[PDB]
Every structure is written in structure tokens, then in C-alpha cells.
Symmetry: C2
Subunit: 122 residues, 2 copies
């Protein structure tokens, strides 16, 4: 669920997701459209796609367990939905971490009106 | 949404909600029933009630903003749903903080089969 996702982002990036990953670019936040602005933004696009591919599940609300093994996120053994939701979240948290090096504060609060390109298909 | 709720619990208690508040007692976790075991557990019962009183809203998934003023949680100015959802979450995070003094690890992983009393009404 989004509870686990927030904690995973914090744990993997060191950043509060509410201040770094909730109103960023065209995709990191509510209502994604247009072309992702950069690699971080593309992480959000891909995560949206990953959730959209699970119409048989409830990715935002289905709780799951995870832990770490040798510093890395390992999803718990849950239902098939929990497993797939957890892997979406894990991939995104890792993506954010790998792309910290090009994170740009200038894309915070980027207005959706300028996300004006034909929205990328998953 | 649950993303903000997790961050609020962490910020107010200092504890990871996934390890302290996700499988505790009869109510802190999935599927609440029976009598709350203690004050912390009752926080979870009350939060469940608070969400249940918002059938016109989507408390687990509707994102909202909050910040702090003089160290205390202040909900952002959002829709009426966002405002009410945020206040449910704020009350619960504060409740957990106020009741840290009686938190008991013995109630972690408490089995739902023993939450066997007629479930308390909101």
C-alpha cells in the first residue's frame, strides 16, 4: 500500500517522499500526463504503469511486508497481488535512489498545464 | 492517504509504523475486531472509526499536504475530504505519541483469533 511505499522511498533515498517525490515533474504526484521531465520523473511514470498493470489488485491500499537482506529491499512472501505491488514499489524506490544524482529542485511544483505533450503510453 | 499517514506516524512517534503499528493488538493492522487491548490499540480503533465516517471520501488513497507549526502537525488547506482525512490521521499520530508510555511489545503479532469479543461499535 502507499504506507509501505512511503517508508520504502524514505529508506532507500533518505528523502521524505512528501517533500521530494509528491509534486515533482509531470508524473511524481497526482494526475500524470505529458512527457517525463527527467530520470526521477520517469521513475514515477514507470511506477504508475506498474500499478496500472494490476487491475486485479488494489496497489494503493493492499498492505504487504518487506525487509532488508544485505542492505537491499526484499519483498515479503504474500499473496500474488502483494508480491507484485511490492515489486512495483521496490523498483521505484531503487529508481529514485539511482537517479538522485540528477534530481533537480527546479522541477518541484512543476505545473501540470505545461505537461502538455501527448501522454506517453505504458 | 496512507502515504501521508505513515510519514505522520513516524514524524510524531519516532517509530517506523511498519514495525510498531501494523501488526499490534486487535486493531493496529488489517481487519480489526473484538476489544482493543490497550490505549495504543484504541488509537487504531478510533482511526478506523474516523475513516469509516467518511464514505463520501477515499481516506486511504486521497493525497493531502501537511506541515508543522511550532512542532505540531497542521493539516494543509485542501478539499473538505482532504481536510477531514488529514484530521483523522493527525489525531491518530498524536494518540500514538501520547500513549508510547504504555506501548507493549507483547501485543505485537497478537492473533486475530483471540480478538474474540463482540466488536466494539464506533
Amino acid at each position: 500500500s502507499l504506507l509501505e511505499f512511503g517508508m520504502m522511498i524514505l529508506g532507500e533515498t533518505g528523502k521524505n517522499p512528501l517533500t521530494s517525490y509528491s509534486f515533482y515533474g509531470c508524473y511524481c504526484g497526482v494526475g500524470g500526463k505529458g512527457t517525463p521531465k527527467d530520470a526521477t520523473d520517469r521513475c514515477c511514470f514507470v511506477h504508475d504503469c506498474c500499478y496500472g498493470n494490476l487491475p486485479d489488485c488494489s496497489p494503493k491500499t493492499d498492505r504487504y511486508k518487506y525487509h532488508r537482506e544485505n542492505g537491499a529491499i526484499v519483498c515479503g512472501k504474500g499473496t500474488s497481488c502483494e508480491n507484485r505491488i511490492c515489486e512495483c514499489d521496490r523498483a521505484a524506490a531503487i529508481c529514485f535512489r539511482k537517479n538522485l544524482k540528477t534530481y533537480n529542485y527546479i522541477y518541484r511544483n512543476y505545473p501540470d498545464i505545461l505537461c502538455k505533450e501527448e501522454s506517453e503510453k505504458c
